[PDB]
Design a protein around this ligand. Structure first.
Ligand SMILES: *[C@@H]1O[C@H](CO)[C@@H](O)[C@H](O)[C@H]1NC(C)=O
Ligand SMILES: *[C@@H]1O[C@H](CO)[C@@H](O)[C@H](O)[C@H]1NC(C)=O
Ligand SMILES: *[C@@H]1O[C@H](CO)[C@@H](O)[C@H](O)[C@H]1NC(C)=O
Ligand SMILES: *[C@@H]1O[C@H](CO)[C@@H](O)[C@H](O)[C@H]1NC(C)=O
Ligand SMILES: *[C@@H]1O[C@H](CO)[C@@H](O)[C@H](O)[C@H]1NC(C)=O
Ligand SMILES: *[C@@H]1O[C@H](CO)[C@@H](O)[C@H](O)[C@H]1NC(C)=O
Ligand code: ALF
Ligand SMILES: [Mg+2]
Lengths: 939, 214
């Protein structure tokens, strides 16, 4: 009958707004059942063609999962990197030319090994991330009760719902017996909702039946139900990673250009020289071995040019940082998530659970004619009053509500019953006076005239008859109802005095109004002792409900967490804008937003509900357009009555927007299932640890293990440290690759001999530099990082100070290495390694050049500790054992390589004074650093 | 005694012409079973046949080819005849050390190898003031150990004042002569002290800057 999209659009209405709609369009529910060709009393025929036709039209109740990518296919995707392709080709041609004899296979083989390293790491990272998000039976389904799997349900079914059931699909309410449902999976509020045809007939998928029984007619079944929408929006690289990939690609292509120029220059010079002077016969005998040597030199320029071990260095720095962040109660689930929050420009935050404690709590009190803005001390007031209050609340309760142990780590006690009553049950205990035996004195069997919830006045009262024949009445209820019916105020230790207007009008506007303006619900308790003849008719009560003795008035709220306001103030000083996106009504949302600091009463912002938001961002054909979101989102601060789709739409609109000229990075904090989509769409998502709702846990990037909002501040500062650490490595590594190239190029042109070999530089790029990265990652973060603005999403990555340092240090290294090349044999009184014959043994000249290069980079690891303009690069160096251990280990391995490396490394052993001169030259880099730290980068 | 007529002796020059050596068994009453060529007493490969009259050809005569060749005839019941042809070439030095670096108080060794026939005479010399002059053994430390195609000059207890220099080895025959040079360098014992002091300077400078900066 009705098309799928029609019913799906119908199922997005709640409350009385649904009821009228139905009556307008599809009459009563027994008519909409007829339109689906189903009978509420009979049920469903169960015939196979009917069932299959319905499954074809409206879909099935089953969502197929997305199979995960395999490690082999991740390796195959890792192999398709351009930087790896050029290196594989170079290694192949090197191993090829090696076997033209008319151990030269080491070099090419070494290159392959480096590739086999990088891939095996990169794939592994891509694997672990895939493994984090992997997480993302029978019901009575007929009038004639038949247990059927949930996947077999079809639109038009008649289902029966009882206590404890979890609803399998969206539907409508035919008939029942006092249904109360828990819809926290969709709204995030843990309140029981009463389902009746006149009030609210909509039943939704995934919600939990708290009380009652009934039967329903299924309307949306598969990916069209609310849980299906949530899982569709959950799917079922990074900002820094994108910047790094772009930089690596352009460095690689610069290296290719330099290698090609080297080869063509060598070939052209050879040809021109030979055919000018010799003019030998054109027989192509010699004439081949020269070309082989030219191609080997051209491959060497490429190998020294590119940073082979950059993914390894980034991975090890990020792993160290994650390990350290764990102590600040931030569980980072995958590596590349530790940086994003450093540059976030916005936070969209859930209210209940995240910014509040989600416990109904008495915050303010009016007892003894003294206002308590804070809970008083035990026995700080009349003991008779305290006993009477405790007994009143406990006995008046008379209901199944109890308080329970946390059952978890660092969790609050769990309130199982109605919220308000549990508020007072916790208040009596917060007075440091135990109530457990008082109630147990009177079992509910020894009980009398009780009217529950008193739908007339919504004020609940009881009578109790132990003390004497004079039976005692205990009544609690809303202030607006109960207050005027009271006649006595017990003030202090003194006896209760009579009051009336001007004796109750003064507390109004001095006590009640401030409480109501604090967003507090007001509940007042009263008692009577009258020895009158027993008249517990349940119909003669109106005369009884007067002359109350009002003992107190309390204020109950869901209170803000203690540390939220200061954390929000710190986050705003860092250049971040905080917005509230909640599923609760707008009054509570706005009150909590004022207390938390999100809105200051300046009245220049937007507070909206979900309906207005959805309507105002759509065209005449009812589809979302970015240009209309760009008007709402810049000044929106509170969004209330929002579904999962509204949260997802808002975060998507903020991320995609091109206004404001500063492109946005968005973080989302939440603890509920309805926050699952947005937590996934956000650049970084935070989930509350103890208050799990595990779906929010697998959707999130970071878990706050203590439910502390201040941890988010510690996540900004840590994220601004990780960034710095990587820009300490980039300054170091880019100084190596530049110098090497200018040495490998020039040496090739003039001397045609390759002063820096390929294995020599695969040791430097692969092994030495990843440990340099780990050493440079080890400074601890400080709060002074919270004093700077967020960086742009497309900032260059290489600042002006980094450029100044790279060029100023390359000048020193290049002038000294060229001095060594051209006049080094005279200074050290040795013989030259220049223009060496074919397959000649290693040299001390070129071993001194290599060892000096490595000493200069080793002492530049210390200079790379400051990326701004600070002089003192030794600040904290001796406090750090990892840095010193790594530097000494690198020194020892270099000694072993030079002394015992042999031909494979192209090293001949050096004397002691030659080592001392290498160390002298390398240590002059720390003095050149103090020279160039004087130059102001503003020039 | 069987009579063998042999070809004339040949001097290998820089010419690339092949050279053919001949042996003729002009008189023999004994039943020969075979014959073979030898160089320096070592039999050349693939040189045994009937070959009552036998020939050996060198397509690319070089200095390494020159030597004292023999053409041996082995008979059933007669002693072998080893008639000999000499192939003369100028000496060619095929081995030396480019440089010899040692510490004072140690001992140094320098050597030369050659390829020629007849085996050359060896003489060592040292460049003094532009001209090579004979080694003077006034110290008593020099130890020349000449040999047939090898020669060594060994020095014990090196002195840093006079020993460092350039030493030439000369090999001579009736045809020509070949000489190559080596460099000897002696290192001072206080060599690692000058860099070390320099390091002590650098550190001091660094300290001052930071101590003045704060
Ligand atoms: C020596 O042997 C060669 C090669 O058989 C021959 O041509 C030549 O006539 C011989 N000479 C004499 C004198 O027999
Ligand atoms: C070569 O053959 C001839 C003819 O039989 C014979 O007289 C002579 O002894 C042989 N020389 C050898 C086998 O060396
Ligand atoms: C052949 O015998 C003679 C006998 O005087 C000897 O001098 C010569 O060295 C021998 N030839 C070879 C190759 O041994
Ligand atoms: C040099 O004199 C020493 C003194 O004993 C002697 O042993 C050595 O053989 C001499 N060498 C030469 C080449 O005269
Ligand atoms: C030099 O004489 C030695 C003596 O055994 C010999 O082994 C070596 O082959 C000779 N070298 C040359 C080039 O004649
Ligand atoms: C030394 O060697 C040179 C070049 O080989 C040669 O000209 C000279 O005659 C030699 N000195 C002699 C043989 O005394
Ligand atoms: F109460 Al909520 F998102 F958890 F509005
Ligand atoms: Mg919540």
């Amino acid at each position: 009958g009705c098309t799928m999209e029609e019913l799906r659009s119908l199922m997005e209405l709640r409350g009385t707004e649904a009821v009228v709609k139905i009556k307008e369009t599809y009459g009563d529910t027994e008519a909409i059942c007829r339109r689906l060709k189903t009978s509420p009393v009979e049920g469903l025929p169960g015939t196979a063609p009917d069932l299959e036709k319905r499954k074809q039209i409206f879909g099935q109740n089953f969502i197929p999962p997305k199979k995960p990518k395999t490690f082999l296919q991740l390796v195959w995707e890792a192999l398709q990197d351009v930087t790896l392709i050029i290196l594989e080709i170079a290694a192949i041609i090197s191993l090829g030319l090696s076997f033209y004899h008319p151990a030269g296979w080491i070099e090419g083989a070494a290159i392959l090994l480096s590739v086999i390293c990088v891939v095996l790491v990169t794939a592994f990272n891509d694997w672990s991330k895939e493994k984090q998000f992997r997480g993302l039976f029978t019901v009575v389904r007929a009038g004639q009760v038949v247990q059927i799997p949930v996947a077999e349900i079809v639109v038009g079914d008649i289902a029966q719902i009882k206590y404890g059931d979890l609803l399998p699909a969206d539907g409508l309410f035919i008939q029942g017996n006092d249904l109360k449902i828990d819809e926290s999976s969709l709204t995030g509020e843990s309140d029981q909702v009463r389902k009746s045809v006149d009030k609210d007939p909509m039943l939704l998928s995934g919600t939990h039946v708290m009380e009652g029984s009934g039967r329903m007619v299924v309307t949306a079944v598969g990916v069209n139900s609310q849980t299906g929408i949530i899982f569709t929006l959950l799917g079922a690289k990074s900002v820094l990673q994108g910047k790094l990939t772009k930089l690596a690609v352009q460095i690689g292509k610069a290296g290719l250009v330099m290698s090609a120029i080297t080869v063509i220059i060598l070939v052209l010079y050879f040809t021109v020289d030979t055919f000018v002077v010799n003019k030998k016969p054109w027989l192509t005998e010699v004439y081949v071995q020269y070309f082989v040597k030219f191609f080997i030199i051209g491959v060497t320029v490429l190998v020294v040019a590119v940073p082979e071990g950059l993914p390894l260095a980034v991975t090890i720095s990020l792993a160290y940082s994650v390990k350290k962040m764990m102590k600040d109660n931030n569980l980072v689930r995958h590596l590349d998530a530790c940086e994003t929050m450093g540059n976030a420009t916005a936070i969209c935050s859930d209210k209940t659970g995240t910014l509040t404690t989600n416990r109904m709590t008495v915050v303010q009190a009016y007892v003894g004619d003294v206002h308590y803005k804070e809970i008083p001390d035990p026995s700080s007031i009349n003991a008779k009053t305290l006993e009477l209050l405790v007994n009143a609340i406990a006995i008046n309760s008379a209901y199944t509500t109890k308080i329970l142990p946390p059952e978890k780590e660092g969790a609050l006690p769990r309130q199982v019953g109605n919220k308000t009553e549990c508020g007072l049950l916790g208040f009596v205990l917060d007075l440091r006076q135990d109530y457990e035996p008082v109630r147990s004195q009177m079992p509910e069997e020894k009980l009398y005239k009780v009217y529950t919830f008193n739908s007339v006045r919504k004020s609940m009262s009881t009578v109790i008859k132990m003390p004497d024949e004079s039976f005692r009445m205990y009544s609690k209820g809303a202030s607006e109802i109960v207050l005027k019916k009271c006649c006595k105020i017990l003030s202090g230790a003194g006896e209760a005095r009579v009051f009336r207007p001007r004796d109750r009008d003064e507390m109004v506007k001095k006590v009640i109004e401030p409480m109501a303006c604090d967003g507090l619900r007001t509940i007042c308790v009263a008692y009577r002792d009258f020895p009158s003849s027993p008249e517990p008719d349940w119909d003669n009560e109106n005369d009884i409900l007067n002359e109350l003795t009002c003992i107190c008035v309390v204020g109950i709220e869901d209170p803000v967490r203690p540390e939220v306001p200061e954390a929000i103030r710190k986050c705003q000083r860092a250049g971040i804008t905080v917005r509230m996106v909640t599923g609760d009504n707008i009054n509570t949302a706005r009150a909590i937003a004022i207390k938390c600091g999100i809105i200051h009463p300046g009245e220049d912002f937007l507070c909206l509900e979900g309906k207005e938001f959805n309507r105002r961002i759509r065209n005449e054909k009812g589809e979302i357009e970015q240009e209309r979101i760009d008007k709402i989102w810049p000044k929106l601060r509170v969004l209330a009555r929002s579904s999962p789709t509204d949260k997802h739409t808002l975060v998507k609109g903020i991320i995609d927007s091109t206004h404001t000229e500063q492109r946005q990075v968005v973080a989302v904090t939440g603890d509920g299932t309805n926050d699952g989509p947005a937590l996934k769409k956000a650049d970084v998502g935070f989930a509350m640890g103890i208050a799990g709702t595990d779906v929010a846990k697998e959707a999130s990037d970071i878990i706050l293990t203590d439910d502390n909002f201040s941890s988010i501040v510690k996540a900004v500062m840590w994220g601004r440290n990780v960034y710095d650490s990587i820009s300490k490595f980039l300054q170091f590594q880019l100084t190596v690759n530049v110098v090497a190239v200018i040495v490998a190029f020039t040496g090739a042109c003039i001397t045609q001999d390759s002063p820096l070999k390929a294995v020599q530089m695969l040791w430097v790029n692969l092994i030495m530099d990843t440990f340099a990265s780990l050493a440079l990652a080890t400074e601890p973060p400080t709060e002074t990082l919270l004093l700077r603005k967020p960086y742009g999403r497309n900032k260059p990555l290489i600042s002006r100070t980094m450029m100044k340092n790279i060029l100023g240090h390359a000048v020193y290294q290049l002038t000294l290495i060229f001095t060594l090349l051209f006049v080094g044999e005279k200074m050290f009184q040795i013989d030259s390694g220049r223009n060496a014959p074919l397959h000649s043994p290693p040299s001390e000249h070129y071993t001194i050049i290599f060892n000096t290069f490595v000493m200069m980079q080793l002492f530049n690891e210390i200079n790379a500790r400051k990326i701004h303009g600070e002089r003192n690069v030794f600040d904290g160096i001796f406090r750090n054992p990892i840095f010193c251990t790594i530097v000494l280990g690198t020194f020892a391995i270099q000694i072993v390589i030079v002394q015992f490396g042999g031909k494979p490394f192209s090293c001949s052993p050096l004397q002691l004074d030659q080592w001392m001169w290498c160390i002298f030259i390398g240590l002059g880099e720390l003095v050149w650093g103090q020279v160039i730290a004087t130059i102001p980068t503003s020039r | 005694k069987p009579r063998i007529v042999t070809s004339e002796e040949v001097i290998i020059r820089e010419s690339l012409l092949p050279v053919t050596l001949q042996c003729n068994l002009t008189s023999s009453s004994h039943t020969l079973m075979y014959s073979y060529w030898t160089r320096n007493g070592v039999e050349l490969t693939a040189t045994r046949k009937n070959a009552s009259n036998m020939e050996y050809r060198i397509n690319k005569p070089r200095a390494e080819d020159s030597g004292e060749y023999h053409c041996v005839y082995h008979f059933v019941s007669a002693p072998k005849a080893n008639a000999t042809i000499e192939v003369k070439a100028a000496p060619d030095i095929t081995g030396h050390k480019r440089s010899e670096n040692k510490n004072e108080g140690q001992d140094a060794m320098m050597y030369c190898k050659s390829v020629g026939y007849p085996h050359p005479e060896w003489i060592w010399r040292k460049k003094e003031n532009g001209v090579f002059e004979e080694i003077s053994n006034s110290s008593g430390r020099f130890f020349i150990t000449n040999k047939e195609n090898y020669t060594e000059l060994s020095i014990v207890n090196l002195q840093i004042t006079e020993d460092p220099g350039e030493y030439e080895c000369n090999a001579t025959n009736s045809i020509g002569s070949a000489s190559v040079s080596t460099v000897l360098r002696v290192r001072s014992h206080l060599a690692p002290l000058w860099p070390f002091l320099g390091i002590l300077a650098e550190i001091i400078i660094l300290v001052v800057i930071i101590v003045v900066y704060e």
